[PDB]
Amino acid sequence: MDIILGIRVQDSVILASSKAVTRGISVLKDSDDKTRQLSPHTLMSFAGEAGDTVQFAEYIQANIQLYSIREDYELSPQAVSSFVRQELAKSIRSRRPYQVNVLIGGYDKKKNKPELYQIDYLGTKVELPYGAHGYSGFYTFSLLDHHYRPDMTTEEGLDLLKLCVQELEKRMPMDFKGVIVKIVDKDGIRQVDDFQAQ
Amino acid sequence: DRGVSTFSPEGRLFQVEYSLEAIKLGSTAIGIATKEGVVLGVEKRATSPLLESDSIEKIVEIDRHIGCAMSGLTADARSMIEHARTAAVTHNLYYDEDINVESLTQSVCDLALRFGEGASGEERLMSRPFGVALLIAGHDADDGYQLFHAEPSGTFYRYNAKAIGSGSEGAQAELLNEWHSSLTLKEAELLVLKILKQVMEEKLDENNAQLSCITKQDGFKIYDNEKTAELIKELKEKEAAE
Amino acid sequence: QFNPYGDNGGTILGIAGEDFAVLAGDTRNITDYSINSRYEPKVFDCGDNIVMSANGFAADGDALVKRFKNSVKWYHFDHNDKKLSINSAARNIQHLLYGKRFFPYYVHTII
Amino acid sequence: GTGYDLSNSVFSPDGRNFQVEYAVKAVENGTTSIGIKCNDGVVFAVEKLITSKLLVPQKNVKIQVVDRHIGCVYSGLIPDGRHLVNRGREEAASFKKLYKTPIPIPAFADRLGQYVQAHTLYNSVRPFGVSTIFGGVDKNGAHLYMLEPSGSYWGYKGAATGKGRQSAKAELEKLVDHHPEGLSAREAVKQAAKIIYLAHEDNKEKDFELEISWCSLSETNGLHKFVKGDLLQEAIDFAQKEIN
Amino acid sequence: GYDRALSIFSPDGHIFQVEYALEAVKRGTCAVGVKGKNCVVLGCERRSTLKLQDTRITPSKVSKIDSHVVLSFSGLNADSRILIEKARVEAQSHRLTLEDPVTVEYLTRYVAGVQQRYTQSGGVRPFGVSTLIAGFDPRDDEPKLYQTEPSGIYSSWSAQTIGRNSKTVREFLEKNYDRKEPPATVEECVKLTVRSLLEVVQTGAKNIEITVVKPDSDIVALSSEEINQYVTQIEQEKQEQ
Amino acid sequence: AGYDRHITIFSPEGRLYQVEYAFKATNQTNINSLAVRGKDCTVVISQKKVPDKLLDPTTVSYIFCISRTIGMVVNGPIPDARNAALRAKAEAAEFRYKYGYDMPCDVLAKRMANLSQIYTQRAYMRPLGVILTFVSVDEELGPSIYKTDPAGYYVGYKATATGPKQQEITTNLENHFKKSKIDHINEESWEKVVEFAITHMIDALGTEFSKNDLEVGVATKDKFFTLSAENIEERLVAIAEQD
Amino acid sequence: FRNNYDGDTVTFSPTGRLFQVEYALEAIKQGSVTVGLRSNTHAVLVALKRNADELSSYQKKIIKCDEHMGLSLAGLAPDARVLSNYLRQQCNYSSLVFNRKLAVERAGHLLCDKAQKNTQSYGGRPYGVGLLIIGYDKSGAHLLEFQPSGNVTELYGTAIGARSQGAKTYLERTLDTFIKIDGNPDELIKAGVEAISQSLRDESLTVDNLSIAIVGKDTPFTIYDGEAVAKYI
Amino acid sequence: GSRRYDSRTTIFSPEGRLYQVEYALESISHAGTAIGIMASDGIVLAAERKVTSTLLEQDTSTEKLYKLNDKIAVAVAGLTADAEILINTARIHAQNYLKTYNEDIPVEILVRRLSDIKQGYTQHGGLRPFGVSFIYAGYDDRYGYQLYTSNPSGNYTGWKAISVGANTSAAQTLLQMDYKDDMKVDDAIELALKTLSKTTDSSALTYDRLEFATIRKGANDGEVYQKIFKPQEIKDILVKTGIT
Amino acid sequence: MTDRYSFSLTTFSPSGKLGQIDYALTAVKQGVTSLGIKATNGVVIATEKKSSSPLAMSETLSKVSLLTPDIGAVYSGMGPDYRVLVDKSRKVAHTSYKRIYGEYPPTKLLVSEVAKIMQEATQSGGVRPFGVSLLIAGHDEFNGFSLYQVDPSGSYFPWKATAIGKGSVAAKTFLEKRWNDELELEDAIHIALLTLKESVEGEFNGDTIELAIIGDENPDLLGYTGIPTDKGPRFRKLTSQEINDRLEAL
Helix, strand or coil: CCCEEEEECCCCEEEEEECCEEECCEEEECCCCCEEEEECCEEEEEEECCCHHHHHHHHHHHHHHHHHHHHCCCCCHHHHHHHHHHHHHHHHCCCCCCCEEEEEEEEECCCCEEEEEEECCCCCEEECCEEEECCHHHHHHHHHHHHCCCCCCHHHHHHHHHHHHHHHHHHCCCCCCCEEEEEEECCEEEEECCCCCC | CCCCCCECCCCCEHHHHHHHHHHHCCCCEEEEECCCCEEEEEECCCCCCCECHHHCCCEEEEECCEEEEEEECHHHHHHHHHHHHHHHHHHHHHHCCCCCHHHHHHHHHHHHCCCEECCCCCCCEECCCCCEEEEEEEEECCCEEEEEEECCCCCEEEECEEEECCCHHHHHHHHHHHCCCCCCHHHHHHHHHHHHHHHCCCCCCCCCEEEEEEECCCEEEECCHHHHHHHHHHHHHHHHCC | CCCCCCCCCCCEEEEECCCCEEEEECCCEEECCEEEECCCCCCEECCCCCEEEEEECHHHHHHHHHHHHHHHHHHHHHCCCCCCCHHHHHHHHHHHHHCCCCCCCCEEEEC | CCCCCCCCCCCCCCCCCHHHHHHHHHHHCCCCEEEEEECCEEEEEEEEECCCCCECCCCCCCCEEECCCEEEEEEECHHHHHHHHHHHHHHHHHHHHHHCCCCCHHHHHHHHHHHHHHCCCCCCECCCCEEEEEEEEECCEEEEEEECCCCCEEEECEEEECCCHHHHHHHHHHHHHHCCCCCCHHHHHHHHHHHHHCCHHHHCCCCEEEEEEEEECCCCCCCEEECCHHHHHHHHHHHHHHCC | CCCCCCCCECCCCCEHHHHHHHHHHHHCCCEEEEECCCCEEEEEECCCCCCCECCCCCCCCEEECCCCEEEEEEECHHHHHHHHHHHHHHHHHHHHHHCCCCCHHHHHHHHHHHHHHCCCCCCECCCCEEEEEEECCCCCCCCEEEEECCCCCEEEECEEEECCCHHHHHHHHHCCCCCCCCCCCHHHHHHHHHHHHHHHHCCCCCCEEEEEEECCCEEEECCHHHHHHHHHHHHHHHHCC | CHHHHCCCCCCCCCCCHHHHHHHHHCCCCCCCEEEEECCCEEEEEEECCCCCCCECHHHCCCEEECCCCCEEEEECCHHHHHHHHHHHHHHHHHHHHHHCCCCCHHHHHHHHHHHHHHHHHECCCCCCCCEEEEEEEECCCEEEEEEECCCCCEEEECEEEECCCHHHHHHHHHHHHHHHCCCCCCCCCCHHHHHHHHHHHHHHHCCCCCCCCEEEEEEECCEEEECCHHHHHHHHHHHHCCC | CHHHCCCCCCCCCCCCCCHHHHHHHHHHHCCCCEEEEECCCEEEEEEECCCCCCCECCCCCEEEEECCEEEEEEECHHHHHHHHHHHHHHHHHHHHHHCCCCCHHHHHHHHHHHHHHCCCECCCCCCCEEEEEEEEECCEEEEEEECCCCCEEEECEEEECCCHHHHHHHHHHCHHHHCCCCCCHHHHHHHHHHHHHHHCCCCCCCCCCEEEEEEECCEEEEEEEHHHHHHHC | CHHHHCCCCCCECCCCCEHHHHHHHHHHCCCCCEEEEECCCEEEEEEECCCCCCCECCCCCCCCEEECCCCEEEEEEECHHHHHHHHHHHHHHHHHHHHHHCCCCCHHHHHHHHHHHHHHCCCECCCCCCCEEEEEEEEECCCEEEEEEECCCCCEEEECEEEECCCHHHHHHHHHHHCCCCCCHHHHHHHHHHHHHHHCCCCCCCHHHEEEEEEECCCCCCCCCEEECCHHHHHHHHHHCCCC | CCCCCCCECCCECCCCCEHHHHHHHHHHHHCCCEEEEEECCEEEEEEECCCCCCCECHHHCCCCEEEECCEEEEEEECHHHHHHHHHHHHHHHHHHHHHHHCCCCCHHHHHHHHHHHHHHCCCCECECCCCEEEEEEEEECCCEECCEEECCCCCEEEECEEEECCCHHHHHHHHHHHCCCCCCHHHHHHHHHHHHHHCCCCCCCCCCEEEEEECCCCHHHCCCCCCCCCCCCCEEECCHHHHHHHHCCC
16 A cells, blocks of 8 residues: 555644555556545545545545535534544444545634544544554654654644655655645645645 | 225226326327327416426427327326336347337336235335326337327327317317328428417417427427427418418 | 356357358257267247357256247237347347346357 | 124124125025035035026036145135135145145145135135035045135035025935935935036026036045046936936 | 325315415415526515524524525425435435536426425325525526425426415516516615515514525525615615605 | 224223124124033033034034143134134144243133233234133143133133023032032042033033033043043933932 | 225125126226137137227237237226236246146136235225137137136137127027138138127228237237238228 | 224325324323523523322422433423333434534434424324424533424424423413523523413412423533432422512 | 234324323223332232132232332233233343343333333324223332332323222322321331222122232242342232231231
């Protein structure tokens, strides 16, 4: 395994997700967005089995959007992540489980605090200052254990990611074709367009 | 009370008979069959001038070679149309060809008697008969241009011409005289428009009536308001001439 | 374990001319190194000027031919005696076969 | 009040199920049919009204076999009778499959009994419009039975139902008194033919056709068979002679 | 289990249960919709049998089905929640499979279909609800307004009203709405809506609510004062004559 | 309104007419029956009426062998009687299979009483027009009589009677038990208990019986059986050499 | 009386009648006339088709069931469709499972049993159609009459529908002639066409008006309509 | 069949009303009155016990006030048993919400769901509706203190003050008369009692004929407390407000 | 076949009454009087064994039934209805409680379950309400002693003392005069035996009266020794002999 990274700083959560889509012998796409906006202040990144990945994401997306309209209200990141967890925990004991790992990054407009949730296909959830799925964490967790501070600015978090990606581009065997980076703060979700030569 | 599939002492099914009364209250629909095509025309009958007349869809496409017009409780026709489109498309998938108009009609009429509170035969899950009649028109290679009248009784008749709805008896007598085996499509268009004008409660115009046809070459098309307007100019002038 | 498939050997051949077509097959039926029959027909007239052969596992072959014959019978019933065109038979056969996608008829069929 | 007779499983104030009693009226409206038990078997017979010359003679057969050893005949609504034999045939198949031995006649009678009784338990079904006379041979001899629309049945020496049941029942009573030593299969066949000729007087407006069957340990080897050809004609003759 | 045919034909060809479902609509508070050149406005009346309500948390009369489509209704309130829910579910399902939000006509066809179905299924009674559905198709800026009824019949209206005294307000609208020249402004469209409602409500500051829908998911409900300003300007048009 | 007499719903007086009319049906056969307890047996006597000469008298019975140990006599029409019999046999078989001992008389009574209770409460099931008297020598309670009706009621008895002349037979028996001061017939041999039962049947009904006017079932330790015509004749002869 | 007992098929009248079944039978007599007759080598169906308007078609009355069996209808057409379709299935099941053409007699028994169920249960209704079944099997030519009561009857000839008593009297009278009309199909049909006309009144039987079906020894069940029946008028 | 005995609980009258709903509301109108008042710092629930006796154990008794959640309670007007069915499913729905989201259920969501259950019994299934009306008193972090009402129609609305059960017309007049938006809980407690005291179909308002609940943000925590008053506690509060 | 009665048989009348519930209550009024009294160290339930014939064995019919070792029930109205409810009550006490928390349910909760069964028969398709009122007496660790009345509607209420059936009104009154919160168990048995005398017409003895108590633990009625924490049912039926011993000092 796709690179799925997340880091929570002072006022935001940042998600970096690899752009490659590879099937067998060929890199089919180098511009894939491995992410779904669940609500204006909540974002989910995902990696895993070929089909289950987008099917599960889009299914969670549909459900949160429905809730938003029925209640005219945005669910907290915590509430969204618990919903997702239960869905995955159902899945693990069904006829054919969803083989999908997720990061959920949201800004809780009630508290004014950023939140990052790591959840694997088994429905194991944990709240973290930074997280990764697959092999990514084997290179990145020690970089972050070192350079991470709770009070970092968004700009500081992006430099820290750049470092993580550089480590992944040096030591990992697969060409994952760079990452798409997204920031979730009080104002919403935006995409950093300039990461190719920052 | 009484079962929804009960016979009258005259040997008719109550609920089916009462369904025909609902048809009588519907907007008029007329079809003519010619060797150049089959025309279908209807009476929009808006209940208020604030109603946007072109949102009244009483002539629908079933497949490229089959269209239909409805009269009565038009809401009941939706699932009939849906079944009809599925039957036609499915046939094409299974057989790489067009469904015969007769076969398509028979399929729709199969739905009709599938009502009851659990009738001992197959599963008829529908609480009552349909309250809408259907004029189904189309073309196929075997049996040429065709017009069918499909009732909630499950029976269907083929007609050279037929009128259904509130003005049907009047329109039918008029069709009885006017129809012959050598109409042209243009004659048929004018004829439908004329007879609709007679039985209609408004002054017929391109807004409150709609025309359509099915030809082998161009398939089923609903005439836009401009084209119908011209045919009305044309009919008004040919009648004033004598 | 039980194996639901066998192989009755058997070879068929179709050639289309300008205004004719042929479907030929040998008449030998086998199981391993034994001959079951020296004359067991394997090419059948199906009506509507359609000939058919489903060569491979004979039990599967027989069911398919049987089931397509019955398809022609109903086509006549359901569509006012219309002749089933060759292209329409072909498409019908596809569905018969594909209906057993996950437990296939173990035959190679030519019409 | 009233209305007790409009629904099937309903007790009238006098403990009756009127819907069943109305079914009995449909039976009494029917053709007459009989059963005669004999010293080693049973004989069945029925009247077949010739509605028209156009009915093919000997063709619209009314007596029905169940398994290989049981005969069934009935009066009333014929379709209802057929329905009962169908169930009877399933009921026999099921018994034979599990226990190997063909179903004993008493055992068979209760299977029909319970099924008919079932149709008097609910308002969602109608009771049976037939009375059914049936029987045959088993491990311990011959048995004759008659089953009413209520599910009521008993063993009989002789049995009758339909338009001419009284005439038939009278004639049957005579034989029981005059033959305490036990009729033979051969004689019962003749006697049966007579009984139907004598119940035809209560229906003498439309000609009729006679139909006999029997099941006899010595004469049919315990198997149900129809009486045909020479033995049928002989019985018609025996009857046609004593009508004069 | 329960499959009694409740909607059945009577000898004159009527379905009485559907017919009585309309009577429940006539009993519901009035609702009106008018389309402008670049907007659609939805107006609803509030009853005053009981007044001591909490307006913050009392379910209001106009519902968003998606962010670009809204629904309002006359009739049984409880029946309408079921239709609202099914419409909201269908909206999400449509986005999920077609990768496009519903057209207003599609959503209307859906709700109407559901209503029709409850007119010919055993064990159920028809919805005591007629609906007004309004908004803009994805990426269209042409305003859309449709109406559905207990029978499952639907159609689009330049302007339409439903509920108690809709006969009155329909009359107003029939001789105040010119198809040649829709109210070209949001403001004059909100005015025409309040006017038509005032023919029926008889003095309504807390008795009138208004929702404005413009293209690209631009939906806003007015406050009492913003409405009250329209009430003041309308009454002075009479008095200056 | 008027339909509270067609199905088993309450009437304004809190009554269930269908159950009441079911009780009416129990006397349709116009037969009386009675049951008594011996020292180590239980006897059931029932009138036997064969009007039709065409019938086969051997198949005309209202007593049933439910199990090796349990006998049941029915008052009410034969079709409902046989329905109850079939069920009780199936229940007695099942109980044995599942619990490894023979179903007790009282327990089977209770079970059948509960089934009847259901028809009393659920509208689609009609009550059966029958009263069921269950008899045995239970391995725990000794001689046993348990009787169920269409209301779902059931109870144990010292002795009992059922039918059109139930009341006459009941008081007769009551009168014997006030005098004897015990709750059974002090007799060692079932034959004398049968004889007692027939005798008091005669006294209360004012009728003399031949061998074909009765039907007798006897329950002993580990059997329930019915008496033949000739067995009954032997009983009738003995009572005569006393009067 | 009658008012109270004709609500459903599940109710007996106090005289033992089933009124719903009788009412279903009424639908038949309102239906257009049809005739069946047979010799020893062929069986024939003759049906008078009925239109709605001079603009309408004449509705088909004869349905093929197998190569050796078919029927004519009088009453509710959709119920003829349901029953003939069931018959097509039974004929079919016989060929597939047993390689056996289904005996006409047995087809009769199946039709009887299917109709009977619908006369004993709540929620259902009797069939509203009468059927004349013809067929050639291993015991020769056959004609059957089906009634929605469930009564099926084998006959040399018969007629059902409006004014059917005319043709039925004629057939009863002509019995000894047509029963011998062996090896000659055209004459058997002629005897049928002459039978059906004994029930005419409104109108003669014309080209698009007559419908003929024939089955027999070496003749598969086939339908004649229009120009094809012209030589019989 | 059955049709004959079907009351048809879910049909429209010729006027477009729902018979069984209207008649259910009629039943509720004879139930002990229940009142809910909403303040700025909490909610009051007051309900009158319909019928009492010296021997009724009021210690262990509960018939009108039920705890649904830790943040939500209800007052019942109507059939107690019918209410318990609904209470239990409401309690489960709350736990399902909490399990799914790790947050306590918003008050309206729970109210809407119960109203939907109620609504169903109105449109399909052929069953009688529940003879129950609820006053819901709750708190969530979106809207704070909330007061809702639901009835057999399955319609629900929000309130500043409201009464259900008997004498609602009289009670509504009095509440509308003395209610003000800036009310404090303690004042609301008084209003609730005064109103009941003037509307009772009984002589005088004693403690053993009441149930009382408050939901307060008790200023000593900076979390929301449900208090279901004990008999002695109702007795005390009754003295302070000057009803002794 | 098939139960096709899927609609309610109890519906609202225009006056808002539920007819069948009223009618069930009327059937309960016809029933033989039964009563319950709560003491400080026990509860007592009692009724009359209305023998339908002197040939019938009254002992074989129990109107007072054990539900759990600490809970008993008595009734008025239709005996057969009661008997089935006792069967379901014993079963529900297991399936919904003992099999889940390894202990018997507290009285209020077992009562709650019974009440549910009766409510369902008020609403479910194709049935009539139960024609009984129950009096359920019991003990549990955290609630102590407690008496409940369940009615055909499924409503239940806690009582200090009460009576149902034929002479309920009269007997309820007599209980009001004699009840206080200091009664010992014997005091209550005595008061019960007095209350029941006014109801019976004929014979009044230990063979006609059925009376049981919920009191102290009965280690002698356990059947085994060795688990110190099981000290014995609190439910006990008083014998024929036990009744008469007290009727002499009456």
